[model samples]
Target: TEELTTVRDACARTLENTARTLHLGASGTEFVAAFRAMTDHWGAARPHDLPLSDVSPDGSPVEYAVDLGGLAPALQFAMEPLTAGVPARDPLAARAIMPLLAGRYGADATRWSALADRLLPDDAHGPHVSMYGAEVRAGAPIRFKAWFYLNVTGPDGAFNLLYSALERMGTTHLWPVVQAHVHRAGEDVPFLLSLDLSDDPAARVKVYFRHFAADVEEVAAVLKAYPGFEPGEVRAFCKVMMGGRRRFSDQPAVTCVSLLDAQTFDRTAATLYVPLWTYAEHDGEVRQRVHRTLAAWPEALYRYDSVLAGIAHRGLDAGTGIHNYISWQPGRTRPRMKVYLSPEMHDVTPPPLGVSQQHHLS
Candidate 1:
C-alpha cells in the first residue's frame, strides 16, 4: 500500500512540474488538484486497488494528449480509475468515483454519471468506468468524460444504455447508424462507450471498437457508413504504420466513431488510435513513421519531438516510453493527429543520457 502511494505521488509531482514549466495558468494547477483529489479518493475507497501504479506496462494509469490543432498546445490527460485485474471491485470503485466527482465539480459531473447507474444493473461483474479525461486550458471550464467498457457478455445492455444516453442528450437519431456499425461488425466486437458530462447541449457520445486483428479493410468498411469519413486514409494508415499488427501483441486497430451533432447526426469523425510503441521497436521508429504520415502537413511536424521529450519522464528507451498512442483523425484536407504520451508513473527508470530538457511551449 505504501509502495502504491509513493508511485502515485511521484507521477503527480511530475505532472505538477510540467504544468508549471509550460505555464498552463490557473486551469493547469486546478487540473493537477483534481487529479490528486481523485487519487486520494481512490486510496481511501479501494485501499487494495492500484489506481496509478503497476496498472499498465509503463506502470502508470495516466496518459497525456498533446493536441496538434495549433502551435499553442491544449494538454489533456486520461486515466483508468479502477484496477486492472480486479473486475468485481471495479463497479464499486466506479460507483464511488461518480459521487466524489459530483461533490467536487458540482452539477456538471452528474450529467454523465446517470449512464453509470443505467449500465451497472445489467452486468454486475463487467468493467464499469474504463477511463476518464479532461482538458487543461486557461479560462476554460473543467470538462469531464468517462469511457464505459461494454463487456461482451451483455452487448444488448450496453447498446440500451448507449441509446438511452443518446436519447437523454437529444441525439437519438444516431442510434440507427450506431446500430448499423455494430450489426455489420458482427458479434464479439469489444466496445467502449464514452459520454461527455457537461451542460453543453452538443456534448458528444462516442463508441470505440477494438480491431483485435487490425484488418484495414474491415475497419474501413465499418466506418464507410459515417458521413465525411474517408476510408482510404485509414487503409493507408494501417498499411504504413500498423503493418498488419495488433494493438500490443497482434497489432489490432482501435477506432472511434464520434456523433458530433445533437440536432443532426450527419456530422461525424473517425479517429484511429495507433499503438505506435507496439508497432515500432523504439522511440526513433515512432518519429520516422509519424514524419512519413504527416509529410504533407509540415505544420504538425514542427517541434513535435520536443513535445515527446517533455513527457518522456521515464526515459525514451526504457521499455514503454515516448509515444504510447498517436491518434489520427482523417479529413478531406488537413488530417489531424495527437500524440498520447506515457509518463511511466511507477517505474524508477532514470532518464537516459542526452535526454532533451528543452520543451516547445508555444
Candidate 2:
C-alpha cells in the first residue's frame, strides 16, 4: 500500500488561505488560535524527530519541513475579527506553498514551529501565553515562542494607557528573567526582546542590549528612567546619536557593545562611535595603539593628557578631518580618566592639514 500523504496534504490544505489568514487583526484572540493550530499540524507531520538532519537516501522523506501547529491557535486568537466577516480558507494549499513564503522572506522555520507548539499544545492548557514563569523553568532556553496577545489596539490614547499600565506594573521586572536565560557562558543563542506595534499613532522602536542580568537592580533602574521609552525609542536615540558617524575601518559595525569586554564596564555605558576615516588615513590606528598601550600598562597610571600632547606634536593627527582631545576623568565619573578624539573630520577641532593644502605646500 502507498504511504499516507499526511504532511503534504496538511500543507496543501493550509496554503489555500494564506493571504486571507495573514491579514487578520494584529491582536485578536481568534487569530492567535488559528495560527497556533496551523503550526501544530505542521509540526506533527514531520517525517522524523530530528530537526537538523540530512535528506533521507531514497527521497522517502521530505528534506525541509514547515511546521505550523502552534501558529494555528495563535492565528485563531488574532483572527476573530476576520472570522466574523470572512469565510475560512482551505488549509492544505496554504501549507504546500509555505516554503515559498519562508524562503522569500527569511522566516525562521524552527522558531515559527516552536511558537506553534507553545501556543497550541496538545494538552489541556489550550491556547495560552507563555509567561516569564514558563521561560525560566525550561532552563531558560532560547525557546522561540511568540506571545499571541496584542497589547496595543486602535487609538493612540488607548495605547498610551496600556503603556502606562505596563510601566506602573513594573514590566522591567521581566528583564532579569530573560537575562538569566541569555547570559550563559559560551552560548550563542540569538536572544531578542521585541515590542510589537499597532495601527495606533504611537511610536514604535526596537532596542538591543548586551549582558543583561536579572539580579542587577541597576538594569531595571536604568530602563525605568525612561517611562515611555520602548524599543523603538532606543533605536531613535541611536539613529540621532550615531546616524552620520563613520564606520571604524570600513568593516561592518557592531551595533551593540558586546564588542568590548563586559566585565570592565557597565554594559549600558558601552556604545559604538565610528571614527570618520580609515585606519591608515585616519586616527583609528592611533586610538588603537593608545588602547593597547593602556591595556599593557594599566597600573602605570601616567597622565594621558601629556601622552596625547606628545603624540599630537608628532603630527600623528586624528585620521581624516577629526581632532584628538584627551580628558583624564570623563564626565567626572571615574577616579582615573582618559579621553581622546579620533582624526576623523568630526572629532578634530582645527581640521587636520587638508589634502589640497598638503599637496600645495609640499
Candidate 3:
C-alpha cells in the first residue's frame, strides 16, 4: 500500500509492461477489464486523517496536517467522537488530539477552540444545528480525481495541486458555505478550522484525502508504466499521495465539517445521501432525531420520487424514519434515493474519534 517514490513507476516503457493498470482514460480496451480489478488492500474504510499506525516509516515522530472530506461535520462526532476513538489513543500526543480528526465543517469556522463554541454550544446537537458543506473542486487539468476518485498525481505534483486546491476550496467555497449555514437565526458555527502557528501566528489548512491509494508504491507501480507521461506530466497523473496532505498541518489536524442542517436530504447526496442516524448511532437514534428534526423541517418543499433525477428528489413520507438505497453499478447516472419520516431514534454509541472502519472513510 505504499507508493513507488522512485521515478521508475512513471517510466512509460515500464508502464507498457504493467498490467491491471489500464487506468482511467488510458487507450487500451484489451487490458481494461483485466486491469481495473487490482487493489492496494490498503487501509480499511476510515478517515485518511485518522491514524491507525504511525505514519512515519523511519520511526521518527509522525508529523501532522489538516484533513477534510465528504463526511459531514455532525456525523463525525457520532462516528468518531473527539472524546474517544482516534484522538484518545495517542499516548504521546503533546498537542490535543481530536482537532486532528476533522470529519467536516461549514462557514465562520475560522481557526480556534473559542470559535467552535460560538455556534454549537456545550449541548444542543440536533437537526437545528447549522454547518458548512465543502464543495472541493479540482482545477480543470486534474478534474478526474474528484474527492471520490484516485488522484494520479504523485507526491510532488499532488503536494502542489492539493495545496492550491485547498487554498481555493477554503477561501471562495469554504467561506461561502460557512455563510450559508451561519446566516440562519440561532444557528452557530460550532466547528472551526484551526490556525497552525508553529512559529508565528500565520496559518494554513490540511487536505485529508479520500479514496487515495494506501501507499505511494501501489499507484507508482502503475504510474511507472504509463506511456509517455512527461516527468512533470507523469507526476500529474494517477493519484493523490500523502505527501501533499501530510505536509499542510503543522500538527495533527482533523477534517472540519461544514455544518448543514440534517434533513430529508442533505447537501451531500451524491458523495453520500449521508444519513442522520443508522451507522452513527446504529439503528437507534432514528425515531427521536427524526421527530426532533422534522418538527420544523419544511417537509412541504420536497417532492417524493420513485427515482432520483438531475439532483436528488426526496419524498414527504409520513411513515418510517430515514433510510436510502445505494447502487454502485458503473454508467448509471443516478442511484435510487429514499427517506421515510417517523420518530424512531435507535440506540448506538458513536465511535470514539479515530476508530477508522470500513464505512467511515472521509
Candidate 4:
C-alpha cells in the first residue's frame, strides 16, 4: 500500500503541476459552474459540479484539450476503439481534430454568449466545451457533454472570465499550459494530450488528445523543437503497410525513442497501421516510465501531465502492472523484460501506467 501511494503521488505531483498551471486563474469548481449556466439542457450534470480532480491531488487523471481544436485527433483516432464497442471514426485529413470543436459555443445562451464575445473575438472562438468523457470502469463510460447544442465559448480564453465570475473564483492565468500550443504548426504542437479521470471514486472519466505525423520524419521534427526531448532518440511507426482492405497483417509501423525519420518507415507490400487502441496507453507507459525517471522532465523538460500529446512512442514490453513498474524507481532502463505471460491480454498491465493502480482510475 505504501508503495502504491509513493508511486502515485510522484505521478500525482506531475499532474497537479499541470492542473495548477491549467486552472491558474480558475478553480476546481469553475468549469462546472460555467457549463451548467451555458447548458441548462445538460440534464443532471450541474455541469459546473464536475470536480477537476476527484481527490486526485496531482491531476494526471485529466481529459483536457491538446490543441486549439479542443481534442487530440491522433490519440483519439488511434485509441478510440480499444475501450468502446463502437470507436470514434477518423477524420478526412491526416493531422486533424476539428470535428470535436465548435467554431463558437452557445450563441443562444445569454450568459455563455456574453462571456464568449467579451473574452474572445469571433475568430478566437473555437470549441466551447466541445466534448468530455471518461471510464467509471475500463468500459463503463461516464460521459459529459455541453448539451452538444449549447456553447459556452472560448474554451481557451473564456475559461477564467467565466470561472472568476462564479463566486469571484478568480481569473485566467496569463499563460495557461492548456492554451500554449495554439496558433502553431503541426510540427510545432504536441503529439498527444491525455487526462486519466478513471480513478474517480465511483466512476471513471478518461480522455486524451494527440497530434501525429505519418512516419518518423515527423516525429524527429517535433522532438527537436519541443526542447529537453532528445531529438536524437526518436523512432518511427513502420507497421505493416497496406491499404484499408485485406485483413490487418503485421507491423512495420515501428516506433521507439531511439529511431528517427519518415524515410526509415518505407511502405511494405503488407498493410499498415496506426491504432490508438493499444499504443495509446501501454508501451506508451514504459515510454513514460523513461519520462518518470528523467530528473528535469517536469514542466521544463515536459509538461509532466500533458506532454504525451507531443512526445514519441516506443515498442517496449507492456507494463502490465497497475503501477506499470512505477512502484520501483527507474535506472538505466525500465523495460517490460519481465515478459508478461500472454502479453496484450487486457488487464495484464492496467492503468496508472506506473502512476498508480488500475483501480486508481476505476
Candidate 5:
C-alpha cells in the first residue's frame, strides 16, 4: 500500500516546519534526511498497515517521540521495519536498516553488528531484535539506538545471551547487579536490552526487567540497586503516569536501569514504563491523564499537543494514542516525561475545524 511513502512525506514536512519554529539546526536536518531514507526502504521492502504494525507492544510500528524538557519539544521517530500481521521474528528490521545508518550517518557499524551477533544468536522464533530509534535536538550529536527483546528462548536462555553480550561488549560491570533480578520460577522475565550506539562508549546501555508483580515494592527493590536514581521520584512518576489505576496483570510494566560505563561505572539512571494501553480505557482518557501532568510545562505541552492534534483522526483515537515513559536521576525534583505518539497513517477521518492538516508550527 506504500504506507511508508505517505508517513514519510507527512513527517518530513512536519519536521521541516518544526525545525524552523524551534530553531533546530544541524541535528534537525540530519533527522529529516535519515528519517526519509529509512522510511523509503521500509515502505518498499516490508510494508505494513497504515495504522498499526506488529513490532511494538502499542501496535504501531512507527511512533514519534517528544520530550517535555524544552520550551518547544524536540522530535524523534522510533520504527520497526516489519511487515504487517506477522509474529515479530529474528533477523529483524535492524539487519537491513542498521547497516544503512552505519554507512550514511557515520554510526559505529562494526560494534553494533558484533553486539547484535553476540546477543541475538540465530534465533528463528520471536523477534530477538525489534526496534530502533533516534533523537533530533539542537545540542547533542544524533544518538542512534536499537532495542533487543530477549524473551525469545525463555529466562535462562535470555540471561545467558545477556551475560555473554555484556562480557563481549566489555560492559560486564553491570552483570552482578542484573543477575540479581533473574527470572527465577516466575512468569516475569528479563524483557529487553536497549543499546545506544553513540560515539561515546559510556553512553547508557539499559537492561529492562519485565515485571507482572504490580507491587511497587518489588520493582523498587530492583530500582534501589541503581545508586543514583531516587526511589521516591520513581514512585511519584508511576503514581502520576498510572493515573490511579489500582491493579495490573501479565501485560507487564517494565523497569530498567542504565549502565553508564564499564570503565568508571560511576553514575546511573532508572526508568519506568507503564503499560498505558492496558491501563487506559480509551485514547481520550489516556490523553486527559497525560495532559494533566504537563501543566508545569504549558508551552511545551501546548506545542507538542498541537503537533499531535494535527495528526489526530477518528481511527487514530480508537486505539491507545500515547505511551508513557518516565526517567530520573539522583537529585531531580521532577522526573523527565516523554510520550510516544501513535500517528495512524491510514486514518481517513477529517481533521477538526481550523486545524492545519500539515504540521502545525512547533
Candidate 6:
C-alpha cells in the first residue's frame, strides 16, 4: 500500500510540476495551445472522444496518425533559425528534425494528422492523444501523448546541439553523438526511449537505458543534439547483451551447447552419459564422481572456462549445471542434441542405452 501510494503521489507531483514547467513561457503556452487545437480538431472531425474506436470497430484502426501538426510550427520555428544559419535545410532536414522532436515530446501532431489520413480511411479524426506524467488529460481520440522540455541554456544546450546536428545529418550520422552524451549523463539516468506493444491491459510504454555500454554510447549520440539532456548512466553493462543472440548462434558447438543447452543436457553429443554434476559444483565441491572421472580432459570439464568463454563470446552466461543430451535418430539428417538439468539425474548405472561413451574412456 505504501509503495502504491508513494508511486501514485510521486507520479501526481511529477505531472503537476511538468504542467507548470511546460507552460512557463510564451513558447510553452503556444505549444500547449497548438496541442489543444490538435485535440479540438480531432474531436470536431470525429465527433466523439472514442471516435477512432467507434469508426474502425477493430479497436481504433491500426493506421492512426501521430499528430505532429501541433508541433510543426515549433519544430519549424526551432529549425528555421538553424537552417537560415546553415542554408542546407531541406525536406531531409525537416524529416530529420520531425522525428527528433516527436521523440522528445513523444508525438508530433502534424505528422499524426497526415499519417491518420493515410492510415485510417473511415476515422475522420486523427489518432487519439493524451498527455501523461505532469499534465494528465483525456480529451479526444488520441491514442497517446506526453510532453518534455528542452532547456536551451546551460548544460541542456548539449542536447540541442545534438538535435540540430541530427536535423542536418539525420539520425544515422547523429547516433554517435547521442551515444556519447548518454554515457556522460551517468548510469542511473540512461538515454533510452522504450516502447511496449503487448496485448496485456496493464502494459505501458517506457524508455530507459541500463548497463550495456555500447547502447549508452549509441543513445548518448542521439541525446548529444539535445541541450542539457541529463539522464541515467550509460555504463558498459548496458551493452553486455548487445550481440547475445547472434553470438550464441555462431559459437562452436561445445560452447553453444554449454551455454544454450546447459539447462537441459548433461554432456556434449559425443559424451552423452556424463552427468553435468560431473562438472558442476555444489557448495564449492563436486556433487558426484563425474568431475574426477573427467579429470583426464581438464579443459573439457573446467566450469569457469566453459561458462565464461560462452558469456565472454556470447554476452550471456547460458548458466552453469545445465547439460546436453545428444541423440542420433535413424534416417536423421544430423544427430539431435537434447538438453537436461543435473538435478534430474537418477542412480542409473553405467549410463543408459544409445548414450555416447566416448568421454568416459577418453
Task: Specify the highest-TM-score model's number.
Answer: 5
By summed lDDT, the worst window of 10 consecutive residues in model 6 runs over 73-82
What is the C-alpha local distance difference test score of candidate 1?
Answer: 0.59
| lDDT, candidate 1, 1-362, per-residue tens | 25444434665776676666556789888888877766664443332345332123344567777666544556677766654355432466556666777788852555565566655443543433456767666657667777676652354465665677667667787776566665334532546777776667666777776665535677677666566456787677766665445223454557777766422655555577776655655666667777787787776676355556666754455454556677776444566677777765443331221011011111
- Ranked by lDDT, the better of candidates 1 and 6 is 1
- Which portions of model 5 miss their true places by more than 4 Å? 1-7, 10-26, 45-55, 70-72, 83-93, 120-122, 154-156, 181-188, 261-266, 315-319, 324-333, 345-362
What TM-score would every model get versus the actual structure?
0.76, 0.19, 0.21, 0.25, 0.79, 0.18
Question: In model 6, how large is the Cα lDDT of residue 243?
Answer: 16
State the number of backbone clashes in model 2: 87
Question: Listing every candidate in turn, what is its Cα RMSD in Å to the true structure after a full C-alpha superposition?
Answer: 7.6, 23.1, 21.6, 18.1, 7.3, 25.4
Q: Tens digits of per-residue lDDT for model 5 on 1-362?
A: 35445555766676566555556678788777877777674454322343234333434456666766543347777776554343345464557778788888876665576576655546644433467777777766777878776655654577777776677778777786676654433645676787776667566778887777465555555566666546665565566666765434535667676766422556555666665655565567667766766676577567656656654556435655344343334434334566666554433221211012122211
**lDDT (Cα, tens digit) per residue for candidate 4, span 283-355:** 5444444353344423322432343422212233444222111111011322111101111212233322221
lDDT of 5: 0.59
What candidate 3 gets wrong by more than 4 Å, as runs, is 1-38, 41-145, 148-177, 183-362
lDDT of 6 by residue, 126-179 (tens): 122111211122322112332111211222343443244234323334344234
Return the TM-score for candidate 1, rounded to 2 decimals: 0.76
Cα displacement (angstroms), candidate 3, residue 327, comes to: 13
lDDT of 2 at 323: 23
Lowest-scoring 10 consecutive residues by lDDT in candidate 2?
130-139
Better of 2 and 6 by TM-score: 2
Better of 1 and 2 by lDDT: 1
User: Of the pair 1 and 4, which is ahead by TM-score?
Assistant: 1
Residue pairs clashing in model 5 are none
Candidate 1 least-lDDT 10 residues = 353-362
Error of 1 at 34 (Å): 1.9
